[PDB]
């Protein structure tokens, strides 16, 4: 009957928890979704999103810009080793390639 503090800031997170638990119920992944598994999963998604947005915003400052256009995401994914090993077969729209001229072509 009192105030209800949410499950998004009871653990100190940002991604929602009730929406993740609804998407694990409405999907038939299994029968009985456990206690804190959506909290664990929302923390993992937070960490990956923060990891990619750091490099995105850094490259966006270094190209003398203020907004972000997907060329920066293309650079931030394809520069690092680990994200390039994860996102193998993905074509980002409006992406572009990395500069790579071979050794024997240029004089």
């Amino acid at each position: 009957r009192a105030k209800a503090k949410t499950r998004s800031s009871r653990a100190g997170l940002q991604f929602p928890v009730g929406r993740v638990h609804r998407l694990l119920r409405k999907g038939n992944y299994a029968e009985r979704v456990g206690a804190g598994a959506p909290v664990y999963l929302a923390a993992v998604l937070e960490y990956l999103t923060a990891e990619i947005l750091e490099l995105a915003g850094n490259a966006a400052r270094d190209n003398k810009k203020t907004r972000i256009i997907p060329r920066h995401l293309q650079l931030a994914v394809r520069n690092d080793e680990e994200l390039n090993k994860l996102l193998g077969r993905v074509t980002i729209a409006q992406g572009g390639v990395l500069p790579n001229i071979q050794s024997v072509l240029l004089p």
């Binding site: 850094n58 490259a59 270094d62 190209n63 520069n79 990395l98 500069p99 790579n100």
Partner: protein, 179 residues
């Protein structure tokens, strides 16, 4: 044994770094990317790419510990950005103390000190047969002294450049006068 009051007991050196050993496009800094993107990764490379050991030319030289490819940055030469008449007072002061001049200038209005404050980039000798050079960039106006390369350089070679007194380089077409 307790009969030698022998000389060579003076050093005149604040740098007693010299020890017994004296061992002599996958990345970002060799890309065609814009300059501050390479300028970030500059410091993550330069802290462990090279080394400083004893050289036959003049004391301590710069033998790198990584196979540097041609065209990329190596290290920054930074320190106290002094302004142009404190140079002469420090010339008189280090003439009074007996330590040589370590002063590269960004432009002909402001010079950069290295003796009082700096990094490990001081151990670059002058030679008339270099394999590096220098370009000044614009990291948001705060310009820098960063050293590129010229050719493919392997592990165990001294890095030099032209500073523009007989030199100890022994070049094929040496000038032998550093003015």
């Amino acid at each position: 044994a307790r009969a030698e009051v022998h000389l060579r007991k003076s050093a005149f050196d604040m740098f007693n770094f010299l020890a017994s050993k004296h061992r002599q496009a996958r990345r970002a800094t060799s890309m065609d990317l814009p300059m501050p993107m390479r300028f970030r990764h500059l410091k993550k490379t330069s802290k462990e790419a090279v080394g400083v050991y004893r050289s036959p030319i003049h004391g301590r030289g710069l033998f790198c510990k990584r196979n540097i490819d041609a065209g990329e940055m190596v290290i920054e030469y930074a320190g106290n950005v002094i302004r142009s008449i404190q140079t002469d007072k420090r010339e008189k002061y280090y003439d009074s103390k007996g330590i040589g001049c370590y002063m590269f200038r960004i432009d002909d209005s402001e010079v950069v000190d290295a003796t009082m404050h700096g990094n490990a980039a001081r151990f670059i000798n002058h030679s008339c047969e270099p394999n590096c050079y220098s370009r000044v960039i614009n990291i948001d106006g705060q310009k820098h002294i960063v050293i590129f390369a010229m050719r493919k350089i392997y592990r165990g070679e001294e890095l030099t450049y032209d500073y523009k007194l007989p030199c100890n380089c022994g070049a094929k077409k040496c000038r032998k006068f550093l003015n």
